[PDB]
PDB file of C-alpha atoms and ligand atoms in Angstrom:
ATOM      1  CA  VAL L   1      30.874  -5.684  56.449  1.00 26.08           C
ATOM      2  CA  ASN L   2      31.837  -9.041  54.904  1.00 26.49           C
ATOM      3  CA  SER L   3      34.143 -11.903  55.884  1.00 27.44           C
ATOM      4  CA  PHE L   4      36.893 -11.214  53.331  1.00 29.46           C
ATOM      5  CA  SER L   5      40.108 -10.625  55.274  1.00 29.94           C
ATOM      6  CA  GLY L   6      43.569  -9.365  54.403  1.00 28.10           C
ATOM      7  CA  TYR L   7      42.769  -7.668  51.086  1.00 29.31           C
ATOM      8  CA  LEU L   8      44.462  -4.609  49.614  1.00 29.59           C
ATOM      9  CA  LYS L   9      41.786  -2.068  48.636  1.00 28.38           C
ATOM     10  CA  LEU L  10      42.650  -0.984  45.087  1.00 24.72           C
ATOM     11  CA  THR L  11      39.560   1.171  44.432  1.00 27.19           C
ATOM     12  CA  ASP L  12      36.130   1.884  45.890  1.00 29.95           C
ATOM     13  CA  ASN L  13      34.976  -1.619  44.868  1.00 29.55           C
ATOM     14  CA  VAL L  14      38.022  -3.756  43.889  1.00 30.29           C
ATOM     15  CA  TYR L  15      40.149  -5.632  46.445  1.00 31.86           C
ATOM     16  CA  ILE L  16      43.115  -7.994  45.954  1.00 30.83           C
ATOM     17  CA  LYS L  17      44.863 -10.708  47.984  1.00 33.33           C
ATOM     18  CA  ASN L  18      47.781 -13.084  47.350  1.00 34.72           C
ATOM     19  CA  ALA L  19      45.943 -16.392  47.751  1.00 32.76           C
ATOM     20  CA  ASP L  20      44.689 -19.494  45.965  1.00 36.50           C
ATOM     21  CA  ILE L  21      41.069 -18.791  45.010  1.00 38.71           C
ATOM     22  CA  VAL L  22      40.259 -22.376  46.013  1.00 38.80           C
ATOM     23  CA  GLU L  23      41.496 -21.765  49.564  1.00 39.70           C
ATOM     24  CA  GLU L  24      39.749 -18.384  49.774  1.00 39.50           C
ATOM     25  CA  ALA L  25      36.503 -20.063  48.728  1.00 41.07           C
ATOM     26  CA  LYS L  26      36.924 -22.873  51.263  1.00 40.54           C
ATOM     27  CA  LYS L  27      37.529 -20.346  54.054  1.00 37.92           C
ATOM     28  CA  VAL L  28      34.933 -17.712  53.160  1.00 37.91           C
ATOM     29  CA  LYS L  29      32.162 -19.751  51.487  1.00 37.24           C
ATOM     30  CA  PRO L  30      31.223 -16.689  49.407  1.00 37.97           C
ATOM     31  CA  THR L  31      27.855 -16.245  47.777  1.00 37.56           C
ATOM     32  CA  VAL L  32      29.607 -16.285  44.380  1.00 39.12           C
ATOM     33  CA  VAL L  33      32.961 -17.714  43.313  1.00 38.45           C
ATOM     34  CA  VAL L  34      33.967 -16.993  39.715  1.00 38.35           C
ATOM     35  CA  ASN L  35      35.448 -19.761  37.576  1.00 36.68           C
ATOM     36  CA  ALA L  36      37.776 -18.929  34.682  1.00 35.91           C
ATOM     37  CA  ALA L  37      35.804 -21.181  32.355  1.00 36.92           C
ATOM     38  CA  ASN L  38      35.987 -22.155  28.697  1.00 39.19           C
ATOM     39  CA  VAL L  39      33.014 -22.394  26.326  1.00 38.38           C
ATOM     40  CA  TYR L  40      32.635 -26.177  26.826  1.00 36.96           C
ATOM     41  CA  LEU L  41      32.935 -26.015  30.633  1.00 38.50           C
ATOM     42  CA  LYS L  42      35.779 -28.543  30.419  1.00 41.18           C
ATOM     43  CA  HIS L  43      37.544 -27.814  33.709  1.00 38.59           C
ATOM     44  CA  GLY L  44      40.890 -29.370  32.909  1.00 39.36           C
ATOM     45  CA  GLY L  45      43.513 -27.034  34.334  1.00 37.33           C
ATOM     46  CA  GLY L  46      44.217 -23.590  35.687  1.00 36.56           C
ATOM     47  CA  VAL L  47      41.615 -22.108  38.022  1.00 39.56           C
ATOM     48  CA  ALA L  48      38.923 -24.330  36.509  1.00 40.52           C
ATOM     49  CA  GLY L  49      40.851 -27.559  37.008  1.00 39.17           C
ATOM     50  CA  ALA L  50      41.707 -26.557  40.578  1.00 38.42           C
ATOM     51  CA  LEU L  51      38.138 -25.569  41.506  1.00 39.53           C
ATOM     52  CA  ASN L  52      36.736 -28.723  39.943  1.00 38.90           C
ATOM     53  CA  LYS L  53      39.266 -30.950  41.734  1.00 39.14           C
ATOM     54  CA  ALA L  54      38.238 -29.332  45.029  1.00 40.16           C
ATOM     55  CA  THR L  55      34.602 -30.370  44.314  1.00 40.68           C
ATOM     56  CA  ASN L  56      35.659 -34.001  43.755  1.00 42.01           C
ATOM     57  CA  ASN L  57      34.588 -33.625  40.065  1.00 42.68           C
ATOM     58  CA  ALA L  58      31.003 -32.657  40.987  1.00 40.60           C
ATOM     59  CA  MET L  59      31.477 -29.344  39.155  1.00 40.37           C
ATOM     60  CA  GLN L  60      32.395 -31.239  35.970  1.00 41.45           C
ATOM     61  CA  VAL L  61      29.412 -33.613  36.260  1.00 43.15           C
ATOM     62  CA  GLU L  62      27.023 -30.677  36.680  1.00 42.15           C
ATOM     63  CA  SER L  63      28.721 -28.805  33.838  1.00 39.09           C
ATOM     64  CA  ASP L  64      28.425 -31.729  31.418  1.00 35.16           C
ATOM     65  CA  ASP L  65      24.675 -31.836  32.022  1.00 33.22           C
ATOM     66  CA  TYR L  66      24.482 -28.057  31.494  1.00 31.93           C
ATOM     67  CA  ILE L  67      26.262 -28.307  28.127  1.00 32.11           C
ATOM     68  CA  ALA L  68      24.201 -31.314  27.032  1.00 34.31           C
ATOM     69  CA  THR L  69      21.048 -29.235  27.606  1.00 36.40           C
ATOM     70  CA  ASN L  70      22.156 -25.750  26.545  1.00 31.45           C
ATOM     71  CA  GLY L  71      25.186 -26.056  24.270  1.00 31.14           C
ATOM     72  CA  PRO L  72      28.416 -24.103  24.685  1.00 33.21           C
ATOM     73  CA  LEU L  73      28.729 -20.670  26.201  1.00 36.07           C
ATOM     74  CA  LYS L  74      29.886 -17.649  24.205  1.00 38.49           C
ATOM     75  CA  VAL L  75      33.346 -16.179  24.666  1.00 35.37           C
ATOM     76  CA  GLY L  76      32.590 -13.233  26.941  1.00 37.26           C
ATOM     77  CA  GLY L  77      29.544 -15.025  28.365  1.00 38.10           C
ATOM     78  CA  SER L  78      28.709 -16.796  31.601  1.00 37.80           C
ATOM     79  CA  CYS L  79      26.346 -19.103  33.413  1.00 34.53           C
ATOM     80  CA  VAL L  80      25.437 -19.546  37.081  1.00 31.11           C
ATOM     81  CA  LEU L  81      25.795 -23.076  38.450  1.00 31.27           C
ATOM     82  CA  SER L  82      26.210 -24.560  41.909  1.00 34.70           C
ATOM     83  CA  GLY L  83      29.150 -23.578  44.071  1.00 34.55           C
ATOM     84  CA  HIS L  84      29.190 -27.107  45.543  1.00 35.45           C
ATOM     85  CA  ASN L  85      31.319 -27.193  48.725  1.00 33.68           C
ATOM     86  CA  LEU L  86      33.112 -23.945  47.818  1.00 33.27           C
ATOM     87  CA  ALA L  87      30.414 -21.252  47.569  1.00 32.47           C
ATOM     88  CA  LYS L  88      26.673 -20.903  47.195  1.00 31.08           C
ATOM     89  CA  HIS L  89      27.022 -20.311  43.443  1.00 30.86           C
ATOM     90  CA  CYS L  90      29.747 -20.541  40.840  1.00 28.67           C
ATOM     91  CA  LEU L  91      29.656 -17.937  38.070  1.00 28.23           C
ATOM     92  CA  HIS L  92      31.438 -19.609  35.138  1.00 29.45           C
ATOM     93  CA  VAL L  93      32.835 -16.747  33.026  1.00 29.92           C
ATOM     94  CA  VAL L  94      34.578 -17.239  29.682  1.00 34.62           C
ATOM     95  CA  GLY L  95      37.355 -14.754  29.063  1.00 34.68           C
ATOM     96  CA  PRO L  96      39.098 -14.835  25.686  1.00 34.25           C
ATOM     97  CA  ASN L  97      41.951 -17.313  25.359  1.00 35.78           C
ATOM     98  CA  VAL L  98      44.728 -15.375  23.642  1.00 33.90           C
ATOM     99  CA  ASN L  99      46.637 -18.550  22.769  1.00 31.37           C
ATOM    100  CA  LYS L 100      43.644 -19.433  20.556  1.00 34.34           C
ATOM    101  CA  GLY L 101      43.681 -15.966  18.977  1.00 34.16           C
ATOM    102  CA  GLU L 102      40.394 -14.882  20.548  1.00 32.74           C
ATOM    103  CA  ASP L 103      39.614 -11.163  20.578  1.00 36.12           C
ATOM    104  CA  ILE L 104      41.039  -9.544  23.707  1.00 36.80           C
ATOM    105  CA  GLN L 105      38.333  -6.861  23.518  1.00 36.56           C
ATOM    106  CA  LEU L 106      35.963  -9.612  24.674  1.00 38.19           C
ATOM    107  CA  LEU L 107      37.647  -9.353  28.088  1.00 38.33           C
ATOM    108  CA  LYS L 108      35.495  -6.326  28.938  1.00 37.17           C
ATOM    109  CA  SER L 109      32.337  -8.253  28.008  1.00 36.24           C
ATOM    110  CA  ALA L 110      33.524 -11.110  30.232  1.00 34.88           C
ATOM    111  CA  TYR L 111      33.979  -8.813  33.239  1.00 34.57           C
ATOM    112  CA  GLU L 112      30.539  -7.238  32.669  1.00 35.41           C
ATOM    113  CA  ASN L 113      29.029 -10.506  33.908  1.00 35.49           C
ATOM    114  CA  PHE L 114      30.353  -9.672  37.383  1.00 34.26           C
ATOM    115  CA  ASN L 115      27.983  -6.673  37.588  1.00 34.31           C
ATOM    116  CA  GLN L 116      25.015  -9.033  37.983  1.00 32.59           C
ATOM    117  CA  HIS L 117      26.305  -9.996  41.472  1.00 36.39           C
ATOM    118  CA  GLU L 118      26.700  -7.645  44.419  1.00 35.90           C
ATOM    119  CA  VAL L 119      29.821  -9.374  45.821  1.00 40.52           C
ATOM    120  CA  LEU L 120      32.156 -11.937  44.220  1.00 40.04           C
ATOM    121  CA  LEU L 121      35.372 -13.832  44.862  1.00 40.62           C
ATOM    122  CA  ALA L 122      37.126 -13.927  41.509  1.00 41.59           C
ATOM    123  CA  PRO L 123      40.328 -14.752  39.619  1.00 38.38           C
ATOM    124  CA  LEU L 124      41.988 -12.601  36.974  1.00 40.51           C
ATOM    125  CA  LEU L 125      40.141 -13.506  33.782  1.00 40.00           C
ATOM    126  CA  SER L 126      42.199 -14.367  30.682  1.00 39.02           C
ATOM    127  CA  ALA L 127      45.428 -14.468  32.756  1.00 41.51           C
ATOM    128  CA  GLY L 128      47.602 -17.512  33.399  1.00 43.06           C
ATOM    129  CA  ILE L 129      47.154 -20.333  30.896  1.00 41.52           C
ATOM    130  CA  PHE L 130      44.608 -18.198  29.000  1.00 43.89           C
ATOM    131  CA  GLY L 131      47.585 -16.206  27.726  1.00 44.21           C
ATOM    132  CA  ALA L 132      46.635 -12.536  28.202  1.00 44.06           C
ATOM    133  CA  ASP L 133      48.559  -9.785  30.014  1.00 45.63           C
ATOM    134  CA  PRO L 134      47.518  -9.891  33.704  1.00 46.44           C
ATOM    135  CA  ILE L 135      48.235  -6.185  34.239  1.00 45.97           C
ATOM    136  CA  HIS L 136      45.746  -5.526  31.455  1.00 47.37           C
ATOM    137  CA  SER L 137      43.203  -7.923  32.960  1.00 46.42           C
ATOM    138  CA  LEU L 138      43.345  -6.080  36.290  1.00 48.49           C
ATOM    139  CA  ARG L 139      42.919  -2.741  34.510  1.00 47.47           C
ATOM    140  CA  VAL L 140      39.856  -3.984  32.602  1.00 47.23           C
ATOM    141  CA  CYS L 141      38.420  -5.385  35.836  1.00 47.96           C
ATOM    142  CA  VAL L 142      38.779  -2.073  37.674  1.00 48.46           C
ATOM    143  CA  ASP L 143      37.346  -0.116  34.727  1.00 47.62           C
ATOM    144  CA  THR L 144      34.401  -2.500  34.133  1.00 46.54           C
ATOM    145  CA  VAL L 145      33.225  -4.079  37.382  1.00 48.01           C
ATOM    146  CA  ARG L 146      31.121  -1.812  39.593  1.00 47.82           C
ATOM    147  CA  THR L 147      30.058  -4.412  42.157  1.00 47.76           C
ATOM    148  CA  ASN L 148      32.337  -5.529  44.998  1.00 51.11           C
ATOM    149  CA  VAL L 149      35.023  -7.879  43.698  1.00 50.97           C
ATOM    150  CA  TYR L 150      37.643  -9.687  45.782  1.00 51.75           C
ATOM    151  CA  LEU L 151      40.449 -10.866  43.502  1.00 52.68           C
ATOM    152  CA  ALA L 152      42.542 -13.803  44.707  1.00 50.64           C
ATOM    153  CA  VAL L 153      45.889 -14.158  42.905  1.00 53.62           C
ATOM    154  CA  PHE L 154      47.815 -17.364  43.619  1.00 51.23           C
ATOM    155  CA  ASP L 155      51.255 -16.533  42.195  1.00 51.20           C
ATOM    156  CA  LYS L 156      53.154 -14.341  44.655  1.00 53.77           C
ATOM    157  CA  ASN L 157      55.533 -12.857  42.093  1.00 54.23           C
ATOM    158  CA  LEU L 158      52.520 -11.961  39.954  1.00 55.57           C
ATOM    159  CA  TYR L 159      50.646 -10.471  42.913  1.00 55.98           C
ATOM    160  CA  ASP L 160      53.689  -8.353  43.782  1.00 56.34           C
ATOM    161  CA  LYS L 161      53.980  -7.277  40.145  1.00 58.21           C
ATOM    162  CA  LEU L 162      50.272  -6.405  40.033  1.00 57.48           C
ATOM    163  CA  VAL L 163      50.377  -4.296  43.198  1.00 61.29           C
ATOM    164  CA  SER L 164      53.598  -2.478  42.317  1.00 61.99           C
ATOM    165  CA  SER L 165      52.361  -1.513  38.834  1.00 63.17           C
ATOM    166  CA  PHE L 166      48.777  -0.553  39.700  1.00 65.16           C
ATOM    167  CA  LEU L 167      47.624   2.875  38.565  1.00 65.80           C
TER     168      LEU L 167
HETATM  169  C1  LIG P 201      43.915 -16.683  37.305  1.00 64.19           C
HETATM  170  C2  LIG P 201      45.304 -16.927  37.877  1.00 64.19           C
HETATM  171  C3  LIG P 201      46.361 -16.887  36.776  1.00 64.19           C
HETATM  172  C4  LIG P 201      47.751 -16.491  37.251  1.00 64.19           C
HETATM  173  N1  LIG P 201      48.307 -17.575  38.062  1.00 64.19           N
HETATM  174  C5  LIG P 201      48.815 -18.837  37.514  1.00 64.19           C
HETATM  175  C6  LIG P 201      49.103 -19.611  38.783  1.00 64.19           C
HETATM  176  O1  LIG P 201      48.875 -18.684  39.875  1.00 64.19           O
HETATM  177  C7  LIG P 201      48.362 -17.532  39.402  1.00 64.19           C
HETATM  178  O2  LIG P 201      48.007 -16.637  40.133  1.00 64.19           O
HETATM  179  N2  LIG P 201      45.346 -18.215  38.572  1.00 64.19           N
HETATM  180  C8  LIG P 201      44.881 -18.413  39.824  1.00 64.19           C
HETATM  181  N3  LIG P 201      44.427 -17.356  40.524  1.00 64.19           N
HETATM  182  C9  LIG P 201      43.952 -17.596  41.751  1.00 64.19           C
HETATM  183  N4  LIG P 201      43.864 -18.757  42.407  1.00 64.19           N
HETATM  184  C10 LIG P 201      44.326 -19.787  41.685  1.00 64.19           C
HETATM  185  N5  LIG P 201      44.327 -21.099  42.078  1.00 64.19           N
HETATM  186  C11 LIG P 201      44.850 -21.870  41.056  1.00 64.19           C
HETATM  187  C12 LIG P 201      45.179 -21.031  40.017  1.00 64.19           C
HETATM  188 BR1  LIG P 201      45.932 -21.584  38.384  1.00 64.19          BR
HETATM  189  C13 LIG P 201      44.850 -19.695  40.404  1.00 64.19           C
HETATM  190 CL1   CL P 202      46.084 -20.362  35.102  1.00 65.46          CL
END
């Protein structure tokens, strides 16, 4: 039993809730919160901008040091950094940005990173300002992640659309 409350159980291991991931993280303090990152860990907007703002820019400061040492991530890749005041750890995962023409097949590779963690609070990768189809992102998540994933979706109309169309 875990502290996640109010989720709709989609499958044996995937759960969904209409909520801001930032608020879910503040309430639950999960072991792992997933950030919808880009390769440079420039947390300007979307989930990343919101998570970083909630850390008072500490996430960005840590991320800039990470990039200075290690260089950019790969599309489809990830790194584990601090969760600051939101979680124990933040798993920064880079889903393809469709608006930049990045290969959508890399979305499966992105979700594979979740399998390295037994339980995660996560957003829909490549959705929102990343430009991909959110129904597709949820499908890839369910068909790729085998560990226990709690998906927080902020937009209510999207959440309703995701539930009503789920197979
Ligand atoms: C990944 C999705 C994208 C779809 N969108 C756009 C606005 O609401 C949505 O659900 N974004 C989020 N998901 C969960 N919590 C969030 N907090 C802040 C945002 Br952005 C966010
Ligand atoms: Cl977004």
